[PDB]
Short mmCIF file of C-alpha atoms in Angstrom, two decimals:
data_model
loop_
_atom_site.label_atom_id
_atom_site.label_comp_id
_atom_site.label_asym_id
_atom_site.label_seq_id
_atom_site.Cartn_x
_atom_site.Cartn_y
_atom_site.Cartn_z
CA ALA Z 18 0.00 0.00 0.00
CA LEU Z 19 3.20 2.07 -0.11
CA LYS Z 20 1.18 5.04 -1.36
CA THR Z 21 -0.84 5.13 1.89
CA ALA Z 22 2.16 4.67 4.17
CA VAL Z 23 3.38 7.92 2.60
CA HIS Z 24 -0.06 9.46 2.85
CA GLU Z 25 0.02 8.59 6.56
CA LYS Z 26 3.36 10.31 7.13
CA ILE Z 27 2.46 13.47 5.23
CA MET Z 28 -1.07 13.90 6.64
CA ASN Z 29 -0.40 12.98 10.26
CA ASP Z 30 3.24 13.82 10.75
CA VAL Z 31 3.26 17.04 8.76
CA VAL Z 32 -0.09 18.66 7.99
CA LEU Z 33 -2.11 17.43 11.01
CA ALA Z 34 0.98 17.36 13.21
CA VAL Z 35 1.27 21.14 12.92
CA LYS Z 36 -2.44 21.92 13.33
CA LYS Z 37 -3.07 23.28 16.84
CA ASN Z 38 -6.01 25.37 15.70
CA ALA Z 39 -7.84 26.83 12.69
CA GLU Z 40 -5.28 29.49 11.68
CA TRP Z 41 -4.56 29.52 7.93
CA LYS Z 42 -1.10 28.25 6.92
CA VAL Z 43 1.02 28.23 3.77
CA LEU Z 44 2.77 25.07 2.52
CA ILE Z 45 6.20 25.68 1.00
CA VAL Z 46 7.64 22.85 -1.09
CA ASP Z 47 10.36 22.34 -3.67
CA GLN Z 48 10.30 20.61 -7.05
CA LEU Z 49 10.97 17.16 -5.61
CA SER Z 50 8.91 17.25 -2.41
CA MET Z 51 5.95 18.49 -4.46
CA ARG Z 52 6.19 15.52 -6.79
CA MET Z 53 6.43 13.35 -3.71
CA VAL Z 54 3.33 14.89 -2.10
CA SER Z 55 1.28 14.82 -5.31
CA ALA Z 56 1.53 11.06 -5.76
CA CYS Z 57 0.07 10.12 -2.37
CA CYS Z 58 -2.07 13.17 -1.63
CA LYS Z 59 -4.92 14.79 -3.50
CA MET Z 60 -4.70 18.57 -3.12
CA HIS Z 61 -8.12 19.06 -1.54
CA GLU Z 62 -6.89 16.88 1.37
CA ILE Z 63 -4.12 19.21 2.53
CA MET Z 64 -6.17 22.31 1.76
CA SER Z 65 -9.02 21.07 3.97
CA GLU Z 66 -6.72 20.81 6.99
CA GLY Z 67 -5.49 24.37 7.44
CA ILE Z 68 -3.22 24.78 4.44
CA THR Z 69 -4.50 27.72 2.37
CA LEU Z 70 -1.76 28.07 -0.27
CA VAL Z 71 1.08 26.08 -1.86
CA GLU Z 72 4.22 27.89 -3.04
CA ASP Z 73 7.48 26.79 -4.63
CA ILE Z 74 10.26 27.77 -2.26
CA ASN Z 75 12.47 28.82 -5.18
CA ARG Z 76 10.42 31.45 -7.02
CA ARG Z 77 9.98 33.93 -4.12
CA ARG Z 78 6.47 35.11 -3.30
CA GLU Z 79 4.26 37.59 -1.45
CA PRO Z 80 5.10 37.87 2.28
CA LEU Z 81 2.45 36.59 4.69
CA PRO Z 82 3.72 37.76 8.14
CA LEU Z 83 0.41 36.74 9.64
CA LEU Z 84 0.48 33.04 8.77
CA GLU Z 85 2.90 30.36 9.86
CA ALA Z 86 4.60 28.45 7.09
CA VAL Z 87 5.09 24.73 6.72
CA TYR Z 88 8.31 24.00 4.84
CA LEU Z 89 8.28 20.51 3.43
CA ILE Z 90 11.52 20.41 1.46
CA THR Z 91 14.74 18.68 0.49
CA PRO Z 92 17.63 19.84 2.74
CA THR Z 93 19.42 21.20 -0.33
CA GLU Z 94 21.85 24.08 -0.79
CA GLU Z 95 19.16 25.94 -2.80
CA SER Z 96 16.08 25.34 -0.66
CA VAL Z 97 17.85 25.98 2.65
CA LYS Z 98 19.12 29.30 1.28
CA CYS Z 99 15.64 30.40 0.26
CA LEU Z 100 14.51 29.26 3.72
CA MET Z 101 17.03 31.37 5.61
CA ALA Z 102 16.13 34.01 3.03
CA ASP Z 103 12.45 34.18 3.96
CA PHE Z 104 13.54 34.84 7.56
CA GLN Z 105 16.78 36.47 6.48
CA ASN Z 106 15.89 39.45 8.68
CA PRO Z 107 13.14 40.44 11.18
CA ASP Z 108 10.30 42.82 10.31
CA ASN Z 109 10.42 41.26 6.84
CA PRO Z 110 9.49 37.73 8.03
CA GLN Z 111 8.19 36.10 4.88
CA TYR Z 112 5.94 34.50 7.51
CA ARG Z 113 5.36 34.59 11.28
CA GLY Z 114 6.68 31.14 12.11
CA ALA Z 115 8.28 28.19 10.40
CA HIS Z 116 7.52 24.50 10.68
CA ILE Z 117 10.35 22.78 8.84
CA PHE Z 118 10.19 19.20 7.61
CA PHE Z 119 13.23 17.90 5.78
CA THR Z 120 12.55 15.26 3.15
CA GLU Z 121 15.81 13.57 4.12
CA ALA Z 122 18.81 13.89 6.41
CA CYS Z 123 20.20 17.41 6.41
CA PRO Z 124 23.93 17.91 5.78
CA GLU Z 125 25.41 19.15 9.07
CA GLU Z 126 27.08 21.80 6.92
CA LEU Z 127 23.72 23.45 6.23
CA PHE Z 128 22.30 22.46 9.60
CA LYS Z 129 24.88 24.57 11.41
CA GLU Z 130 24.41 27.44 8.97
CA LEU Z 131 20.64 27.60 9.55
CA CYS Z 132 20.76 27.10 13.34
CA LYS Z 133 22.69 30.34 13.74
CA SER Z 134 20.81 32.31 11.12
CA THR Z 135 18.16 34.82 12.14
CA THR Z 136 15.83 31.97 11.19
CA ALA Z 137 16.41 30.02 14.39
CA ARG Z 138 13.99 32.12 16.45
CA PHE Z 139 11.10 31.51 14.04
CA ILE Z 140 11.45 27.71 13.92
CA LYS Z 141 8.49 26.17 15.72
CA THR Z 142 9.02 22.65 14.37
CA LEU Z 143 12.14 20.93 13.05
CA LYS Z 144 12.07 17.34 11.89
CA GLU Z 145 13.27 14.84 9.32
CA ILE Z 146 10.34 12.91 7.87
CA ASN Z 147 12.57 10.75 5.71
CA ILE Z 148 10.76 10.25 2.41
CA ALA Z 149 13.31 10.49 -0.39
CA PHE Z 150 11.57 8.60 -3.22
CA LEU Z 151 8.44 8.85 -5.36
CA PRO Z 152 5.57 6.45 -4.54
CA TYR Z 153 5.03 6.25 -8.29
CA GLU Z 154 2.40 3.55 -7.81
CA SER Z 155 1.13 1.46 -4.91
CA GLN Z 156 3.96 -1.02 -5.54
CA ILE Z 157 6.52 0.92 -7.52
CA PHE Z 158 8.85 3.64 -6.29
CA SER Z 159 11.33 5.85 -8.10
CA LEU Z 160 14.37 7.81 -6.91
CA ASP Z 161 14.04 10.00 -9.99
CA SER Z 162 17.79 9.60 -10.35
CA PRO Z 163 18.60 8.65 -13.97
CA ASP Z 164 22.13 10.06 -13.72
CA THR Z 165 22.94 7.03 -11.58
CA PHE Z 166 22.83 5.01 -14.80
CA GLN Z 167 25.80 7.05 -16.01
CA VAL Z 168 27.46 6.55 -12.62
CA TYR Z 169 27.04 2.79 -12.82
CA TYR Z 170 27.77 2.36 -16.53
CA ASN Z 171 30.13 5.10 -17.74
CA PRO Z 172 33.70 4.46 -16.57
CA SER Z 173 34.46 8.19 -16.75
CA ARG Z 174 31.87 8.65 -14.00
CA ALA Z 175 33.44 5.80 -11.97
CA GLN Z 176 35.15 7.12 -8.83
CA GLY Z 177 33.67 10.32 -7.50
CA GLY Z 178 30.37 8.63 -8.20
CA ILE Z 179 30.20 7.10 -4.73
CA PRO Z 180 28.42 10.13 -3.26
CA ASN Z 181 25.63 9.54 -5.79
CA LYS Z 182 25.48 5.84 -5.00
CA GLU Z 183 25.29 6.14 -1.22
CA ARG Z 184 22.74 8.90 -1.70
CA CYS Z 185 20.81 6.26 -3.65
CA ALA Z 186 21.44 3.81 -0.82
CA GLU Z 187 20.06 6.31 1.68
CA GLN Z 188 16.92 6.97 -0.37
CA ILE Z 189 16.33 3.21 -0.53
CA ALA Z 190 16.70 3.03 3.25
CA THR Z 191 14.06 5.75 3.71
CA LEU Z 192 11.78 3.59 1.57
CA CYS Z 193 12.21 0.62 3.92
CA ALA Z 194 11.92 2.84 7.00
CA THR Z 195 8.64 4.17 5.63
CA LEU Z 196 7.41 0.60 5.33
CA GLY Z 197 8.97 -0.29 8.67
CA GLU Z 198 11.11 -3.02 7.12
CA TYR Z 199 14.64 -4.23 7.90
CA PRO Z 200 14.93 -6.88 5.12
CA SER Z 201 17.86 -9.14 4.45
CA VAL Z 202 19.86 -7.79 1.53
CA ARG Z 203 20.69 -9.82 -1.57
CA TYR Z 204 22.34 -8.84 -4.88
CA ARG Z 205 23.10 -10.35 -8.30
CA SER Z 206 26.73 -11.42 -8.01
CA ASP Z 207 27.46 -11.52 -11.72
CA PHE Z 208 27.85 -7.76 -11.95
CA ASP Z 209 30.72 -7.03 -9.55
CA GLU Z 210 29.59 -3.49 -8.76
CA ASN Z 211 26.49 -4.82 -6.98
CA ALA Z 212 28.04 -6.25 -3.81
CA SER Z 213 29.55 -2.84 -3.18
CA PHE Z 214 26.17 -1.13 -3.64
CA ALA Z 215 24.51 -3.69 -1.38
CA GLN Z 216 26.90 -2.83 1.45
CA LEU Z 217 25.96 0.86 1.17
CA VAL Z 218 22.27 0.00 1.34
CA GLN Z 219 22.95 -2.24 4.36
CA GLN Z 220 24.94 0.46 6.17
CA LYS Z 221 22.24 3.03 5.55
CA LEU Z 222 19.44 0.86 6.86
CA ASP Z 223 21.63 -0.26 9.73
CA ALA Z 224 21.83 3.35 10.86
CA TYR Z 225 18.02 3.50 10.77
CA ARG Z 226 17.29 0.47 12.93
CA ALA Z 227 19.90 1.91 15.28
CA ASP Z 228 17.43 4.73 15.98
CA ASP Z 229 14.42 2.38 16.10
CA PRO Z 230 14.41 -1.28 17.28
CA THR Z 231 10.82 -1.77 16.08
CA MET Z 232 11.83 -1.43 12.44
CA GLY Z 233 11.31 -4.91 11.07
CA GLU Z 234 9.24 -6.18 14.00
CA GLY Z 235 8.78 -9.97 13.90
CA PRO Z 236 5.33 -10.02 12.11
CA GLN Z 237 6.63 -11.92 9.05
CA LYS Z 238 8.76 -8.80 8.54
CA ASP Z 239 11.73 -10.98 9.48
CA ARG Z 240 11.38 -12.78 6.14
CA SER Z 241 11.42 -9.61 4.03
CA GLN Z 242 14.18 -9.44 1.43
CA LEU Z 243 15.61 -6.50 -0.53
CA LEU Z 244 17.13 -7.67 -3.83
CA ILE Z 245 19.67 -5.47 -5.62
CA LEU Z 246 19.66 -5.93 -9.39
CA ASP Z 247 21.65 -4.25 -12.15
CA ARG Z 248 20.10 -3.29 -15.47
CA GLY Z 249 22.20 -5.83 -17.34
CA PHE Z 250 20.33 -8.69 -15.60
CA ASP Z 251 17.81 -8.51 -18.41
CA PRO Z 252 18.48 -6.25 -21.41
CA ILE Z 253 15.74 -7.80 -23.52
CA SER Z 254 12.65 -6.68 -21.60
CA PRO Z 255 13.31 -2.97 -21.55
CA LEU Z 256 13.96 -3.04 -25.30
CA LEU Z 257 10.70 -4.77 -26.29
CA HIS Z 258 7.57 -3.25 -27.81
CA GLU Z 259 5.16 -4.39 -25.07
CA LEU Z 260 1.39 -4.51 -25.75
CA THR Z 261 -0.22 -4.14 -22.32
CA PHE Z 262 -2.00 -0.78 -22.07
CA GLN Z 263 0.33 1.25 -19.87
CA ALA Z 264 3.60 -0.20 -21.20
CA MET Z 265 2.50 0.35 -24.79
CA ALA Z 266 1.23 3.93 -24.34
CA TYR Z 267 4.42 5.33 -22.79
CA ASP Z 268 6.47 3.64 -25.50
CA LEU Z 269 4.42 4.65 -28.52
CA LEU Z 270 3.03 8.01 -27.46
CA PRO Z 271 4.57 11.32 -26.28
CA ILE Z 272 3.40 11.13 -22.66
CA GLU Z 273 5.63 13.55 -20.75
CA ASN Z 274 5.56 13.69 -16.93
CA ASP Z 275 2.64 11.27 -17.29
CA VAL Z 276 0.35 13.65 -19.17
CA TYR Z 277 -1.47 12.41 -22.26
CA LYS Z 278 -2.83 15.45 -24.05
CA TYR Z 279 -5.79 15.06 -26.40
CA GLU Z 280 -5.07 16.53 -21.74
CA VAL Z 281 -4.91 14.06 -18.87
CA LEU Z 282 -2.58 12.72 -16.21
CA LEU Z 283 -2.35 8.94 -15.87
CA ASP Z 284 -2.10 8.18 -12.14
CA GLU Z 285 -3.55 5.74 -9.62
CA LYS Z 286 -5.82 8.54 -8.41
CA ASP Z 287 -7.73 7.83 -11.62
CA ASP Z 288 -9.04 4.48 -10.32
CA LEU Z 289 -9.95 3.63 -13.91
CA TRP Z 290 -6.43 3.54 -15.35
CA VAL Z 291 -5.64 1.30 -12.39
CA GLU Z 292 -7.97 -1.27 -13.89
CA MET Z 293 -6.90 -0.85 -17.53
CA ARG Z 294 -3.17 -0.16 -16.97
CA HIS Z 295 -2.07 -3.79 -17.32
CA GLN Z 296 -4.76 -4.90 -19.74
CA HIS Z 297 -3.66 -6.10 -23.17
CA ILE Z 298 -4.52 -3.55 -25.86
CA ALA Z 299 -6.40 -6.33 -27.64
CA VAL Z 300 -9.10 -6.07 -24.98
CA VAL Z 301 -9.10 -2.53 -23.58
CA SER Z 302 -11.87 -1.25 -25.88
CA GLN Z 303 -13.74 -4.56 -25.69
CA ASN Z 304 -13.86 -4.58 -21.90
CA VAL Z 305 -14.87 -0.92 -21.76
CA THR Z 306 -18.20 -2.05 -23.16
CA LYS Z 307 -18.33 -5.46 -21.49
CA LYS Z 308 -18.69 -3.37 -18.34
CA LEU Z 309 -20.49 -0.31 -19.73
CA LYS Z 310 -23.09 -2.79 -20.96
CA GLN Z 311 -22.93 -4.23 -17.44
CA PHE Z 312 -23.95 -0.75 -16.29
CA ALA Z 313 -26.65 -0.08 -18.89
CA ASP Z 314 -28.00 -3.42 -17.67
CA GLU Z 315 -28.02 -3.05 -13.87
CA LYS Z 316 -30.18 0.02 -14.49
CA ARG Z 317 -33.18 -2.09 -15.53
CA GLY Z 318 -41.71 -9.76 -30.94
CA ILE Z 319 -42.17 -6.23 -29.59
CA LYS Z 320 -39.39 -4.39 -27.76
CA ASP Z 321 -40.10 -1.31 -25.59
CA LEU Z 322 -37.27 1.26 -25.67
CA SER Z 323 -38.70 3.59 -23.00
CA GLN Z 324 -36.38 3.21 -20.00
CA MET Z 325 -33.31 3.21 -22.25
CA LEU Z 326 -34.47 6.66 -23.34
CA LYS Z 327 -35.30 7.88 -19.85
CA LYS Z 328 -31.82 6.73 -18.89
CA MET Z 329 -29.62 7.70 -21.84
CA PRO Z 330 -28.40 10.83 -20.04
CA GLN Z 331 -26.90 8.83 -17.19
CA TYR Z 332 -25.47 6.49 -19.82
CA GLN Z 333 -23.78 9.22 -21.86
CA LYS Z 334 -22.25 10.26 -18.54
CA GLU Z 335 -20.50 6.91 -18.18
CA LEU Z 336 -19.46 6.54 -21.83
CA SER Z 337 -17.74 9.85 -21.12
CA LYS Z 338 -15.90 8.43 -18.11
CA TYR Z 339 -13.89 6.46 -20.69
CA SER Z 340 -13.66 9.18 -23.36
CA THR Z 341 -9.98 10.09 -22.98
CA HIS Z 342 -8.81 6.55 -22.21
CA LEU Z 343 -10.43 5.19 -25.36
CA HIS Z 344 -8.67 8.07 -27.10
CA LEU Z 345 -5.49 6.54 -25.66
CA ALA Z 346 -6.08 2.92 -26.73
CA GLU Z 347 -7.12 4.24 -30.15
CA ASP Z 348 -3.87 6.18 -30.43
CA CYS Z 349 -1.84 3.08 -29.56
CA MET Z 350 -3.67 1.00 -32.18
CA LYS Z 351 -3.29 3.44 -35.06
CA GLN Z 352 0.40 3.51 -34.14
CA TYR Z 353 0.44 -0.31 -34.04
CA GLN Z 354 -1.27 -1.13 -37.35
CA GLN Z 355 1.07 1.49 -38.80
CA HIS Z 356 4.48 -0.12 -38.17
CA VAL Z 357 4.60 -1.85 -34.76
CA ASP Z 358 2.97 -5.14 -35.79
CA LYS Z 359 5.93 -5.96 -38.02
CA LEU Z 360 8.42 -5.02 -35.32
CA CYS Z 361 6.83 -7.27 -32.71
CA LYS Z 362 7.03 -10.37 -34.87
CA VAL Z 363 10.80 -9.98 -35.20
CA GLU Z 364 11.30 -8.82 -31.62
CA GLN Z 365 9.35 -11.78 -30.20
CA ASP Z 366 11.38 -14.26 -32.28
CA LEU Z 367 14.65 -12.62 -31.19
CA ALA Z 368 13.71 -12.29 -27.50
CA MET Z 369 12.31 -15.81 -27.23
CA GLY Z 370 14.76 -17.51 -29.53
CA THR Z 371 11.80 -19.52 -30.87
CA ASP Z 372 9.01 -18.77 -33.35
CA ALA Z 373 5.33 -18.67 -32.44
CA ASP Z 374 5.25 -22.44 -33.03
CA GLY Z 375 7.97 -23.22 -30.49
CA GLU Z 376 10.73 -23.81 -33.03
CA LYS Z 377 14.23 -22.40 -32.73
CA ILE Z 378 14.72 -19.51 -35.13
CA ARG Z 379 17.00 -19.37 -38.19
CA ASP Z 380 17.39 -17.23 -41.33
CA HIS Z 381 17.44 -14.14 -39.12
CA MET Z 382 18.29 -11.60 -41.82
CA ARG Z 383 15.31 -12.68 -43.90
CA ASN Z 384 13.23 -10.52 -41.53
CA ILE Z 385 15.84 -8.11 -40.14
CA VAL Z 386 17.10 -6.65 -43.41
CA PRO Z 387 13.65 -5.63 -44.73
CA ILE Z 388 13.08 -3.59 -41.56
CA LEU Z 389 16.59 -2.12 -41.58
CA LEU Z 390 16.28 -1.10 -45.24
CA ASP Z 391 12.85 0.48 -44.60
CA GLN Z 392 13.45 4.22 -44.72
CA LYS Z 393 10.12 4.99 -43.02
CA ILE Z 394 11.06 3.09 -39.84
CA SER Z 395 12.95 5.12 -37.22
CA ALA Z 396 16.58 4.51 -36.35
CA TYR Z 397 15.66 3.78 -32.76
CA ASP Z 398 13.34 0.95 -33.78
CA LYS Z 399 16.16 -0.45 -35.90
CA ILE Z 400 18.57 -0.10 -33.01
CA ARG Z 401 16.20 -2.04 -30.74
CA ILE Z 402 16.08 -4.84 -33.35
CA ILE Z 403 19.89 -4.73 -33.83
CA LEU Z 404 20.45 -5.08 -30.06
CA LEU Z 405 17.87 -7.83 -29.68
CA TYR Z 406 19.65 -9.69 -32.47
CA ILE Z 407 23.09 -9.06 -30.96
CA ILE Z 408 21.79 -10.29 -27.61
CA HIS Z 409 20.14 -13.33 -29.21
CA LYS Z 410 23.40 -14.31 -30.98
CA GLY Z 411 25.43 -13.64 -27.85
CA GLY Z 412 27.75 -11.10 -29.42
CA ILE Z 413 28.69 -10.15 -32.95
CA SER Z 414 31.90 -9.48 -34.89
CA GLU Z 415 32.90 -5.87 -35.56
CA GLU Z 416 32.50 -6.72 -39.24
CA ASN Z 417 28.77 -7.50 -39.06
CA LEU Z 418 27.98 -4.83 -36.50
CA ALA Z 419 29.39 -2.63 -39.23
CA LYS Z 420 27.26 -4.16 -42.00
CA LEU Z 421 24.06 -3.94 -39.95
CA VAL Z 422 24.67 -0.29 -39.05
CA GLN Z 423 25.25 0.26 -42.78
CA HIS Z 424 21.93 -1.20 -43.93
CA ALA Z 425 19.95 0.62 -41.24
CA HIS Z 426 21.58 3.92 -42.15
CA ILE Z 427 22.11 4.62 -38.47
CA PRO Z 428 23.89 7.93 -37.80
CA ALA Z 429 27.40 7.60 -36.34
CA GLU Z 430 26.18 9.51 -33.31
CA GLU Z 431 23.64 6.80 -32.47
CA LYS Z 432 25.91 3.94 -33.57
CA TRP Z 433 27.74 3.89 -30.23
CA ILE Z 434 24.48 3.15 -28.43
CA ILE Z 435 24.82 -0.48 -29.54
CA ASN Z 436 28.44 -0.71 -28.47
CA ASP Z 437 27.79 0.98 -25.13
CA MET Z 438 25.13 -1.59 -24.16
CA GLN Z 439 28.30 -3.56 -23.40
CA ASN Z 440 29.09 -1.50 -20.31
CA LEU Z 441 26.20 -3.27 -18.60
CA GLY Z 442 27.65 -6.72 -19.03
CA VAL Z 443 25.82 -7.69 -22.20
CA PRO Z 444 27.92 -9.51 -24.83
CA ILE Z 445 27.71 -7.56 -28.09
CA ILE Z 446 31.23 -7.67 -29.57
CA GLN Z 447 31.96 -11.37 -30.29
CA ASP Z 448 35.40 -12.72 -29.26
CA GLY Z 449 36.26 -9.70 -27.13
CA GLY Z 450 39.40 -11.69 -26.39
CA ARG Z 451 38.04 -12.08 -22.85
CA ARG Z 452 35.74 -14.65 -21.22
CA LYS Z 453 32.13 -15.87 -21.68
CA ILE Z 454 29.46 -13.49 -20.40
CA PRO Z 455 26.45 -15.40 -19.05
CA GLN Z 456 23.00 -14.55 -20.34
CA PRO Z 457 20.66 -15.65 -17.46
CA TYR Z 458 17.75 -13.85 -19.13
CA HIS Z 459 17.58 -16.09 -22.20
CA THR Z 460 14.64 -18.50 -22.27
CA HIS Z 461 16.79 -21.59 -22.94
CA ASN Z 462 18.49 -20.83 -19.59
CA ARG Z 463 15.30 -20.23 -17.62
CA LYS Z 464 12.61 -22.48 -16.14
CA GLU Z 465 10.13 -23.88 -18.66
CA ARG Z 466 6.93 -21.94 -19.28
CA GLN Z 467 3.90 -22.99 -21.34
CA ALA Z 468 4.39 -22.32 -25.05
CA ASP Z 469 0.69 -21.56 -25.46
CA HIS Z 470 0.35 -17.80 -25.61
CA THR Z 471 -2.92 -15.90 -26.00
CA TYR Z 472 -1.21 -13.49 -28.40
CA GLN Z 473 1.68 -14.39 -30.68
CA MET Z 474 3.02 -10.84 -30.42
CA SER Z 475 3.28 -11.18 -26.63
CA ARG Z 476 5.06 -14.45 -25.74
CA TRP Z 477 7.93 -12.94 -23.80
CA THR Z 478 7.96 -12.97 -20.03
CA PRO Z 479 10.33 -10.65 -18.16
CA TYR Z 480 13.19 -12.49 -16.47
CA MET Z 481 12.23 -10.23 -13.53
CA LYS Z 482 9.11 -12.34 -12.95
CA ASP Z 483 11.15 -15.57 -12.73
CA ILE Z 484 13.18 -13.91 -10.00
CA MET Z 485 10.10 -12.60 -8.17
CA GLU Z 486 8.38 -16.00 -8.21
CA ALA Z 487 11.48 -17.88 -7.10
CA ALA Z 488 12.21 -15.47 -4.24
CA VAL Z 489 8.60 -15.64 -3.07
CA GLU Z 490 9.07 -19.41 -2.66
CA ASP Z 491 12.55 -19.34 -1.13
CA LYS Z 492 13.91 -20.74 -4.39
CA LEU Z 493 16.12 -17.88 -5.61
CA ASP Z 494 19.55 -19.41 -6.16
CA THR Z 495 21.95 -17.96 -3.61
CA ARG Z 496 24.83 -18.81 -5.90
CA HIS Z 497 23.65 -16.03 -8.20
CA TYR Z 498 21.64 -13.91 -5.76
CA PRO Z 499 23.59 -14.15 -2.46
CA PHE Z 500 22.96 -12.43 0.87
CA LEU Z 501 25.84 -10.09 1.66
CA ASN Z 502 25.57 -11.27 5.26
CA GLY Z 503 25.29 -14.93 4.31
CA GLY Z 504 22.30 -16.97 5.44
CA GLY Z 505 18.70 -16.52 4.33
CA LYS Z 506 -0.93 -6.44 8.62
CA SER Z 507 2.12 -8.39 7.47
CA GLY Z 508 4.27 -9.44 4.53
CA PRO Z 509 6.84 -10.63 4.08
CA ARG Z 510 7.73 -8.04 1.48
CA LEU Z 511 10.03 -8.61 -1.49
CA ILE Z 512 11.66 -5.26 -2.29
CA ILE Z 513 13.41 -5.32 -5.62
CA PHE Z 514 15.55 -2.41 -6.66
CA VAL Z 515 17.18 -2.11 -10.04
CA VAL Z 516 19.95 0.41 -10.49
CA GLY Z 517 19.51 1.51 -14.08
CA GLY Z 518 15.74 1.69 -14.40
CA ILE Z 519 12.67 -0.55 -14.57
CA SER Z 520 10.40 -1.05 -17.60
CA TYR Z 521 6.62 -0.84 -17.43
CA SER Z 522 6.47 -4.59 -18.14
CA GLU Z 523 8.51 -5.33 -15.03
CA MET Z 524 6.31 -3.01 -12.96
CA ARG Z 525 3.38 -5.01 -14.37
CA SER Z 526 5.15 -8.22 -13.21
CA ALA Z 527 5.34 -6.87 -9.65
CA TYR Z 528 1.55 -6.79 -9.55
CA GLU Z 529 1.14 -10.15 -11.28
CA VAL Z 530 3.34 -12.07 -8.81
CA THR Z 531 1.83 -10.25 -5.85
CA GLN Z 532 -1.85 -10.88 -6.68
CA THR Z 533 -1.23 -14.50 -7.62
CA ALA Z 534 1.90 -16.35 -6.56
CA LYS Z 535 1.23 -15.47 -2.95
CA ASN Z 536 1.87 -16.62 0.60
CA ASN Z 537 0.98 -13.13 1.82
CA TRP Z 538 4.06 -11.82 0.00
CA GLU Z 539 4.06 -8.31 -1.39
CA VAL Z 540 6.46 -7.39 -4.15
CA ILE Z 541 7.60 -3.77 -4.22
CA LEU Z 542 9.74 -2.84 -7.22
CA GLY Z 543 11.83 0.30 -7.24
CA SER Z 544 14.54 1.80 -9.40
CA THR Z 545 16.78 4.75 -10.08
CA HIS Z 546 14.16 5.80 -12.66
CA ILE Z 547 11.31 4.65 -14.90
CA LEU Z 548 12.42 3.26 -18.28
CA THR Z 549 10.97 3.59 -21.77
CA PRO Z 550 12.55 1.59 -24.59
CA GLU Z 551 13.77 4.79 -26.22
CA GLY Z 552 14.50 6.14 -22.75
CA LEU Z 553 16.93 3.27 -22.27
CA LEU Z 554 18.43 3.95 -25.69
CA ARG Z 555 18.85 7.57 -24.61
CA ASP Z 556 20.63 6.41 -21.47
CA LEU Z 557 23.09 4.29 -23.45
CA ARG Z 558 23.47 7.45 -25.50
CA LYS Z 559 24.79 9.64 -22.67
CA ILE Z 560 27.89 7.55 -22.06
CA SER Z 561 29.47 8.67 -25.34
CA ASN Z 562 27.71 11.89 -26.27
CA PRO Z 563 29.60 14.94 -24.82
#
């Protein structure tokens, strides 16, 4: 319920915590804290409890010496300056009093500064609420930290990147503290940089239980596990054109900051999107009526059409409840019948390694070339196919990489995106004169799954799900996913964090394993950021584009 745990901290420990009476108050937030508050709280909720206005701490505003101010912000250089600035000098008090709530631990550097500023006398509340992540969805959290990808995968960003990493480790710890968990930490051993990141996470959450022995109280919470994965654990999934509603929309359409214009925001506060989000596009429109008909039914050879008439108004009201969403599914389908259909057939063969009939694939170019030499198909779609093919083959010679990039007419700027995928541990350049890089994510290396798929264009299953299901049954190989400490109204909870981003299909998998393969287990998936196939391509981009 992650979204409510946050709701509980904001509402009771911030808003309500400061309410001693009915005096109006102003809520001051910063870019990040606002995003954080938006996800779990609907504006009319804060506003109904004494908060009369919401301002961005950065862009200064009209002074309100008569009202106290609630500062819910990130203890940043910026923010803290603006803070001390609002009370930078008496008789100008931006406000009459200040209730300060730091989103995360405050650097003692700034702490000292502030405590001696002329702001000290106006501070009526000073706390650390510890909420340094976005409760993106009731089971998915983001650290909105895509630069960490560069940190983890660009050698140039290597050392000197530790501050970023342990900051990540601290944000993850606040996530567990919010859930009141002290899970046993595990990490994928095959990517050497993980163990090191796991220690950071462990240290950070160790510091938290130090200040609270009830964190991880026995109630099944002693079985909770926090798995640290690296993006290279499965490079296929984030590259695939997925066809479930949510995953497909963000990939095919220009939905920025989650807003789909002609405009609407896709969030869990929509309650409808929550029911259609994981649905396969093949049935979104269908089901909209299978239920709308279920509505125009619960409200009830010669046939009398009276009622239906007396009740059309209420009907047209409902049909309108789906207006924009149908406009979304429609958009995805036009896009699909346009050029996606053809891409999925090749992608599914490459990702699976078998055709729709279960047979190993062969004569790869027979289908690759035609797409590569199609001038109407974007270079990013060709790059996704190139990579899926590289990955399928387990590495390619420089020669052929060359020939493929030639046929696809891929700019030289984008060309390095393929090559760079290698910094994640994926074998793309054949011999490499080194050793064999395992590909745990390939189907022929995973547990068997039924080869009877509802849709031929959707046979792939994220490797993530295999991991989730195995962990939920105490069957996750410790030889590949070891505990760094050896060993290993309730959960337990399986917290999976991927440094490098999570795809919408993996977020979908979190829900699937939770509401099915249960034993009261709850899978919470989090990451540095939310991935889009092109978004990933853009991230591989930034390690060679300066």
